[PDB]
Structure formats: structure tokens, C-alpha cells
């Protein structure tokens, strides 16, 4: 596979998001690192599907609501940023105020 350090690093992010998706499914309110992981992982998969940067800056605001996360968590996350390989190469997606 010839994995580069950056590909190995994103594997760490995907795994932390698997921890969060399971907890969300048991119906827990997510904490800080769990929330940041879950939303980041969703944007990396949207770039793999070929969605545009602009579509993802928007859809990323709809993954989790304030009722699915612990108190103070939406305030601890003013934005989330993640880069992924889009069909047109690496691009940065910034989601502002993702948890409303």
C-alpha cells in the first residue's frame, strides 16, 4: 500500500471516529474529542465520494446537534478543519460552528 506518514495519521482519526459512532448509536451525548472525530471522519468520506469543498462546509454543520452532545461542547468547538484527497487533490475544509 506504501502508506505515507500522513495516511497513517488519518487512520488514527478514522479509528477515533469509530469509537464515537458506536457511542452515539447507544444514545450517549458525545464529549469533545468524540464530536471532533465524528464530524472530521464524515468530511473525509465526503471528499472520497467526490463532494465539493463548498458542499461539505455546509453539510458538516448538520452531523451533530446540541442535543446529541454534552454541555459546553458546542462552545469548545468554534470550527473543525480537516484535509482530504478530493478528485482534484488535497483541499482543506473548514466547518464553522458545526454544532448548533
Amino acid at each position: 500500500m506504501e502508506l505515507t506518514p500522513r495516511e497513517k495519521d488519518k487512520l488514527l482519526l478514522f479509528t477515533a471516529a469509530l469509537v464515537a459512532e458506536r457511542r452515539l448509536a447507544r444514545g450517549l451525548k458525545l464529549n469533545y474529542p468524540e464530536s471532533v472525530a465524528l464530524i472530521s471522519a464524515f468530511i473525509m468520506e465526503g471528499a472520497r465520494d467526490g463532494k465539493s469543498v463548498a458542499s461539505l462546509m455546509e453539510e458538516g454543520r448538520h452531523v451533530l446537534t446540541r442535543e446529541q452532545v454534552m454541555e459546553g461542547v458546542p462552545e469548545m468547538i468554534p470550527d473543525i478543519q480537516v484535509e482530504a484527497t478530493f478528485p482534484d487533490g488535497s483541499k482543506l475544509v473548514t466547518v464553522h460552528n458545526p454544532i448548533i
Partner: protein, 566 residues
């Protein structure tokens, strides 16, 4: 020109009279003073203040600082103040106002071409922590402690060997020499503890001359009055500290016989509450004496719902105890007492217990010294309200009293307060930068000796440093020769004298311990209370001056599930 306080707080961080909540606790600090001149604050960026001829002057390197931390909110034992911090040659140069005196008023920290900038507006800056109960079970504890905000680790061990599993002792010249060599590779300041248990003083002086800055007397090596007396006589001659884990079994005497062996000489008592070790059930009375510097180790801080349950089992694995060997199991309920565990939190709040420490991988969590100290302060505020010393609507006094327990008091106890322990001029620039929402939990930057040594870092290949995953990674201060320059190995005065550093070819900067014998309880900053304390031999209730000291276990604490993945 005027600006509202709210937009001002947003741009430069809080100022006098503003309050900040520490993480998700109920503790609030209030800014007591601000060293700036409003309108003259330095801010770095495109079109900002720190530029040639503006906030940046024409001085040569010798006349300016290497690094300025701008607009920091300092929290230390001496005050909670807004100021710029200047660092020069790896040390704290000034706390004051930075800038260019060619065009700005009241500049005390000059910025030049040679000055790097860390923007601290909106952040809290503290000294790095000092943990004095480390078992050197593995080298990985250094990075875990550094990530938590601890920059100096004092302890003993040789790796995962039965002796080290049980006790903070680096036994003998050969192991002391190998561990001083291995210490150059770790990014924290280190001093080592030798094996204090012996009744021949020469076997002690040989360890001190080899390099240890202290001796641990531990009951697993025989904490008898003969061994205690011998270690203290050596300590008084060589200016080194003695740490004590007393005879839990009351085999050689009771607490008053150990107190009698000590004979008024300075000693640091480890895990003074007693669950981590010591005369059952009353070692806790040791905090009444003026020559005793008492610390707690952290699994009992603060007292919570699962505390007792978890403890019975962890006793076992540490000490080398058989759960089937009923003598090796009758002493657990004599060791684990909800009575002394609940009183210990209150004793911290009153200042009768002076230091917090880990007891790492030997009934203690190396990355939880700072977080648990704040969780105890929060639980005390919620249960006992404001301290008597407190002035104003804020908890500033309680914050100073608790920050002292893992900063200045351990440096004073161990003879290294001349180098580290507080944000004061001339001391080593070991600083930790925290964002308020993560205060005490996950820092934003850890500076060792004037270089960033570890910090949270996002994707290495990203267009900026902030994209996920963000996790702590070692920086330039943690690498090779730069690391040797930015850390200290502490030695005893004798070793330093005998040229131990040149003989082992130690590469890091060396510092020498001094003042271990003269420190006493009255010297513990904000923590000098000597209570008239008793323990009931049957019920184990703790009383101070006949009043029962107790507290309630928490079901939920702050600095817990909101922050951690597991």
C-alpha cells in the same frame, strides 16, 4: 479612543476585574492587575504592532529578549496578573510590558530582530509542574507527564524491576550512573532518589556522591528506626532530602516511635494520608509537626464514589502481596480507610497538606497530578464555600494555595527552588500555556528551557497546523542536542564536586540541590498549617482540635468525561 471591555477582552485577553472560569469547574479567577498601558499592547500579525520601527526596535541581541509571550494571564502563587513575559538565555527575564522604547512608553521587555513571539492573549500561563514521587518504571512516563504540564520529575527506579515497582529507589552507584546517562534522553528536568534503607552510613554517602539528590526510606526495604536515623544523619551532612514511606505493620514501633527516630530533622513524608503506605492507621498525624513537609499521592484525590472499591485491588499488585496470604490481606482494610481518605481533601483545603505528587504506576497516575489537584479544589469550594483568606467575589486565594502544591512547594522541599518552581525572574523558563476551557487538562504549549518541547499538532502535510487529527507530538525542544540544552539534571553537591558529570559524559545542563535541611513547614507557600490533629485508633475518625474533619464523595467531577476519549 475608547473600546468596550468586551471587544477589548476579545482582542487582548481579559483585564483588571474581569473573571474567567477554570475549565468546567466552579472555580473563577479574577484578574488582579494588568501591567500594560492601554493602547500600547503588543500584538503580532500582518499589519499589527510587532514590526520594524513600531513594536519592534533596533537593538542588538544582547539588548533584547529571545522570546516574548504577549498578553499572558499569569496564574502563580504570587498573583493572577495580566502581563507580557520576556525570556532570555533560557530563563525568565522580566514580567512587564514589552515593546520598542523608541516609540512606546514604559517598555520593560524589549523586542528586537532577535525576538520570537508566542501570542498568549486569551490564554493562561503557569509554571511547569514538579512531581516528586516518580517510580522510574518506564521511560514513557516522561512524555505522559510533560503532556500534562509537569516539567520536572524527581524519583528513583531502574525500570520495571520488583524493587522499582514497589519503591522510588535507584540503588547504588552503577544504577545511579546508568540512570543519570539515560536522563539526557528525556525531555523533563530529573533528579534521582537512592535507596535510603541501611544502618551503615557509608553505603549512603557512596550513593549521594554517585549523584542522587535525595534518599527514599521505604518499609519494603525495612523502614526501622536505625535505618531512618542513619539516612537523616547522612542527609544533614550532605544537604539532600529524605523521603519517607513508614512502617505500615507497626513492626518496629508505632507512628510516635518513627516520629521520635526522626527527631525534629527535615523530612518529606510521601502519601501522608496513608493508603499509599505508612503506620496504620495514623501516619496522617505527621502533618502537625514543623519539620515534616507532607505530600499526598493522587489516587485518593479527591474522594469519590469508586475510590474505595478500586483501592483494595491496586494495593496488591504494587507492593508484591498475596491475597490468599491472609497477613498480606488483613492489612488492606487497615490501609484503605474512608475516614482518612475523606479528611485528606479538607486538610489540603486548609493548607495542612502542602504538595501533591503522582506515585507513578505504583498506586498513582503520572498524567493526573495537576488535574486531580484542581478537582480537589473544586470539590472543596462546592462543599465548604470560600476560604477565610479569600477577599473578593472570586477564588483567587484558593487557586494560589492549590497551584503552590505542585509548583513552588515541591521545588522548596527538594532544594531546587533556585532553578524552577514559579514564574520569577532568573528561573528556568519551563512554562505551560493553557486555553481557559482546557486549563489543567490539556495544554496548548509546553515550553522547556525557553524552547517549545511538546504541543498539540494537526496534520503534518496540511496547509495550516490546525486540521485533524490534532494530538501531542514532540517539538524541537525535545530533540537531541537542543533538548540537552533546555533540560537540567540535578546532582548532589558532592557529585557535582567529584566531577560526576564529566566522568559520565553527561550532556545536559547540570544544576545542584541546596537548602534541603533548612526548609520547614512554615516555609510552604500558602500551606503552612500545623493542625492539632488526632486519629481514633478504633474508628479511625480524624479530628482537628476535637472537631471531626470529614467530606462527601463526588459522584461526578469536572476535568473528566467532557475531555477524554477513553
Amino acid at each position: 479612543s475608547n473600546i468596550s471591555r468586551q471587544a477589548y477582552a476579545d482582542m487582548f485577553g481579559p483585564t483588571v476585574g474581569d473573571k474567567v472560569r477554570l475549565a468546567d469547574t466552579e472555580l473563577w479567577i479574577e484578574v488582579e492587575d494588568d501591567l500594560t498601558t492601554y493602547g500600547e499592547e503588543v500584538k503580532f500579525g500582518g499589519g499589527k504592532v510587532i514590526r520594524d520601527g513600531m513594536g519592534q526596535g533596533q537593538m542588538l541581541a544582547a539588548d533584547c529578549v529571545d522570546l516574548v509571550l504577549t498578553n499572558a494571564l499569569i496564574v502563580d502563587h504570587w498573583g493572577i496578573v495580566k502581563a507580557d513575559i520576556g525570556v532570555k538565555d533560557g530563563r525568565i527575564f522580566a514580567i512587564g510590558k514589552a515593546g520598542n522604547p523608541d516609540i512606546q512608553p514604559n517598555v520593560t521587555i524589549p523586542i528586537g530582530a532577535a525576538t520570537e513571539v508566542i501570542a498568549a492573549e486569551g490564554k493562561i500561563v503557569t509554571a511547569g509542574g514538579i512531581d516528586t514521587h516518580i517510580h522510574w518504571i518506564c521511560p514513557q512516563q516522561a512524555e505522559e507527564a510533560l503532556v500534562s504540564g509537569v516539567t520536572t520529575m524527581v524519583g528513583g527506579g531502574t525500570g520495571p524491576a520488583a524493587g522499582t515497582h514497589a519503591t522510588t529507589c535507584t540503588p547504588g552507584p552503577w544504577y545511579i550512573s546508568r540512570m543519570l546517562q539515560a536522563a539526557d534522553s528525556l525531555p523533563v528536568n530529573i533528579g534521582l532518589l537512592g535507596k535510603g534503607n541501611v544502618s551503615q552510613p557509608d553505603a549512603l554517602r557512596e550513593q549521594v556522591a554517585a549523584g542522587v539528590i535525595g534518599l527514599k526510606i521505604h518499609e519494603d526495604w525495612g523502614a526501622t528506626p536505625a535505618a531512618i536515623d542513619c539516612a537523616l544523619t547522612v542527609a544533614d551532612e550532605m544537604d539532600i532530602q529524605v523521603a519517607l514511606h513508614s512502617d505500615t505493620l507497626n513492626e518496629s514501633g508505632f507512628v510516635e516511635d518513627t516520629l521520635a527516630a526522626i527527631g525534629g530533622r527535615t523530612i518529606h513524608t510521601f502519601h501522608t494520608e496513608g493508603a499509599g503506605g505508612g503506620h496504620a492507621p495514623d501516619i496522617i498525624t505527621a502533618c502537625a509537626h514543623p519539620n515534616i513537609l507532607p505530600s499526598s499521592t493522587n489516587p485518593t484525590l479527591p474522594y469519590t464514589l469508586n475510590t474505595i472499591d478500586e483501592h483494595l485491588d491496586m494495593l496488591m499488585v504494587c507492593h508484591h502481596l498475596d491475597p490468599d496470604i491472609a497477613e498480606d490481606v488483613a492489612f488492606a482494610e487497615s490501609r484503605i480507610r474512608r475516614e482518612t481518605i475523606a479528611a485528606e481533601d479538607v486538610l489540603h483545603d486548609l493548607g495542612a497538606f502542602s504538595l501533591t505528587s503522582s506515585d507513578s504506576q505504583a498506586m498513582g497516575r503520572v498524567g493526573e497530578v495537576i488535574l486531580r489537584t484542581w478537582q480537589v479544589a473544586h470539590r472543596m469550594k462546592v462543599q465548604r464555600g470560600a476560604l477565610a483568606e479569600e477577599t473578593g467575589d472570586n477564588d483567587n486565594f484558593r487557586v494560589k494555595r492549590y497551584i503552590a502544591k505542585y509548583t513552588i512547594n515541591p521545588a522548596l522541599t527538594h532544594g531546587i527552588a533556585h532553578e524552577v518552581g514559579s514564574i520569577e525572574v532568573g528561573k528556568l523558563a519551563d512554562l505551560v500555556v493553557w486555553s481557559p476551557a482546557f486549563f489543567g487538562v490539556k495544554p496548548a504549549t509546553v515550553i522547556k528551557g525557553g524552547m517549545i518541547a511538546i504541543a498539540p499538532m494537526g496534520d503534518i502535510n496540511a496547509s495550516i497546523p490546525t486540521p485533524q487529527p490534532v494530538h501531542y507530538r514532540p517539538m524541537f525542544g525535545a530533540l537531541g542536542s537542543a533538548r540537552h540544552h533546555c533540560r537540567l539534571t540535578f546532582l548532589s553537591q558532592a557529585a557535582a564536586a567529584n566531577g560526576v558529570a564529566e566522568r559520565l559524559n553527561l550532556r545536559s545542563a547540570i544544576a545542584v540541590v541546596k537548602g534541603c535541611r533548612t526548609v520547614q513547614k512554615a516555609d510552604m507557600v500558602h500551606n503552612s498549617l500545623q493542625p492539632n490533629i488526632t486519629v481514633d485508633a478504633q474508628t479511625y475518625e480524624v479530628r482537628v482540635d476535637g472537631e471531626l474533619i470529614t467530606s462527601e464523595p463526588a459522584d461526578v467531577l469536572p476535568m473528566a468525561q467532557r475531555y477524554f476519549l477513553f
